[PDB]
């Protein structure tokens, strides 16, 4: 992977 993964937001 080169285009980053999405970080999780707090629900």
């Amino acid at each position, epitope marked *: 992977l*080169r*285009k*980053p993964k*999405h*970080k*999780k*937001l*707090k629900q």
Partner: antibody
Amino acid sequence: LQLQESGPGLVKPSETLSLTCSVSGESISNSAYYWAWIRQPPGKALEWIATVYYTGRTYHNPSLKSRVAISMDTSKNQFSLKLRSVTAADTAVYYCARTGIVVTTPDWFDPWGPGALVTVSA
Amino acid sequence: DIQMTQSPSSLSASVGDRVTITCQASQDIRNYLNWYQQRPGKAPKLLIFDASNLETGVPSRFSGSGSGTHFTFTISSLQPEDIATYYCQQYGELITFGGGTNVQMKR
């Protein structure tokens, strides 16, 4: 929510820097936030040191991990920083801060403590 | 591992002038980029989070933009209370700061 550093103004070379941030207005055991240390040598840029979570999970600046110990004390609502084998390069203002504001992991720092200047000298 | 290249290192402008600062990330960090303002003797203060979002209480003359690797920070009308050092900061991977930009005023 207020943060306040507390530590020794002076630390002798080769010895261990030790600081503590006391937090009022929010529990550091709250799973919603992380708690980090940042330093800033005089006239130089900000440098993040380490981040600690209530579970014990820690993030470290790779340039400092071998000398850094970050810990949490649930009882006193405090978290600590220890930097071993200090040299003149470690003379800096050290800030505590809250992070993990929106992301489930460290994102930005708000708010900060006032900062404590630690001078390395004999 | 991810380096932020902040430019310029320092600048001077007059009251009401437009001031622009850029930070370039060595890798794509989406919009995981924040901006801080720091006065001498004071702790830094968050101005902009996630590249373009203005923090509550920050004057609208401060703005930010960018995504991926190129980010911009703008003071549309420099005021005397804006004389300070400004820092970018990514959280794509761990935490790194830009080298900083101290903003001075000509008068």
